[PDB]
Amino acid sequence: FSEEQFWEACAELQQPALAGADWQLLVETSGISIYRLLDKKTGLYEYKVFGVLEDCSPTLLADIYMDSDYRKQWDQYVKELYEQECNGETVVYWEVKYPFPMSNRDYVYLRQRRDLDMEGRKIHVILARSTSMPQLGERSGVIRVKQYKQSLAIESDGKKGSKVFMYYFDNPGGQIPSWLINWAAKNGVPNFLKDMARACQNY
Ligand SMILES: CCCCC/C=C\C/C=C\CCCCCCCC(=O)OC[C@H](COP(=O)([O-])OCC[N+](C)(C)C)OC(=O)CCCCCCC/C=C\C/C=C\CCCCC
């Protein structure tokens, strides 16, 4: 991750650039919308998120976005989660819970956060990139996501909460049933955002 990247994540934050291609809404909650672009050739999706979470100190949200020990402790969908230093960077191992029948999914990736000073504004930016390691091979039963990348940008909304922007894409290793998206959309996330807020107030 360079300088380049971190600032790039901030842009759409300032301005949602969706005009480009066939984006589409999907959901709006707690002051947050989720757009998605479907790559017609691969069937893969590309998500984009904006919104405002009042009651979330831009500073907390970020801390909490890096705190595994705690995250592990409150995020109902986290089966396993841990960090290790590899060379000079921090590699994350995360195992996500999928409804049985579906295999859970697990990620190995390089994560990194930097708090930017653009215009005397503290913009907490974090980047994620899948990566690999000899000693941490794929697991049986669990589907290893080898293509995955995400960036999240946080900032004060001026009031009590925060204004944010997020990019996400990963290749899940299998077909994601539209009912799962519907759940995700209609219940999953809403509640997640909820449980999370609760999680900031109780930090
Ligand atoms: C509303 C429309 C729904 C769109 C469909 C989404 C997912 C469908 C695919 C699988 C769903 C199976 C169930 C999983 C539980 C979902 C509950 C949830 O929603 O669990 C929050 C979590 C965000 O993971 P993470 O970013 O905390 O780190 C993630 C690190 N690893 C990528 C390694 C995990 O979901 C995940 O991973 C799952 C990947 C989806 C990411 C794209 C949508 C973003 C959704 C929520 C986050 C939005 C706002 C808050 C985030 C911070 C705000 C500053």
- Give 120 Cα–ligand 1 centroid separation in angstroms: 30
Question: Ligand 1: which residue has its CA nearest to atom 37?
Answer: 96
State the number of CA atoms in the 13 A half-sphere of 178 facing the CB: 2
Architecture of domain 1-203: 2-Layer Sandwich (3.30)
Counting from 1 in the atom list of ligand 1, the atom nearest the Cα of 75 is 20
199 Cβ inside 6 Å of ligand 1: no
Q: What is the DSSP string of 178-192?
A: HHHHHHIIIIIHHHH
State the number of CA atoms in the 13 A half-sphere of 40 facing the CB: 3
Domain ranges of the chain: 1-203
Using CA atoms, how far residue 83 sits from 61, 69, 108, 132, 179, in Å, is 19, 10, 10, 14, 32
Question: Ligand 1: which residue has its CA nearest to atom 50?
Answer: 193
User: Which mutation among 29, 49, 60, 95 tests ligand 1's pocket best, with the greatest number of atoms within 8 A of CB?
Assistant: 49
Of 181, 158, 164, the residue nearest 43 (C-alpha): 181
Residue type (1 letter), 175 = Q
d(CA 176, CA 138): 20
Provide the 3-class DSSP secondary structure of residue 198. Answer: helix
Please say whether the beta carbons of 170 and 145 come within 8 A.
yes
Consult the annotation and say whether 71 binds a ligand.
yes
d(CA 187, CA 181): 10
Give strand pairing partners of 142: none
110 Cβ inside 6 Å of ligand 1: no
Consult the annotation and say whether 65 binds a ligand.
yes
Counting from 1 in the atom list of ligand 1, the atom nearest the Cα of 96 is 34
The experimental method, as deposited, was X-ray
Tokens linked to 169: 């894409």
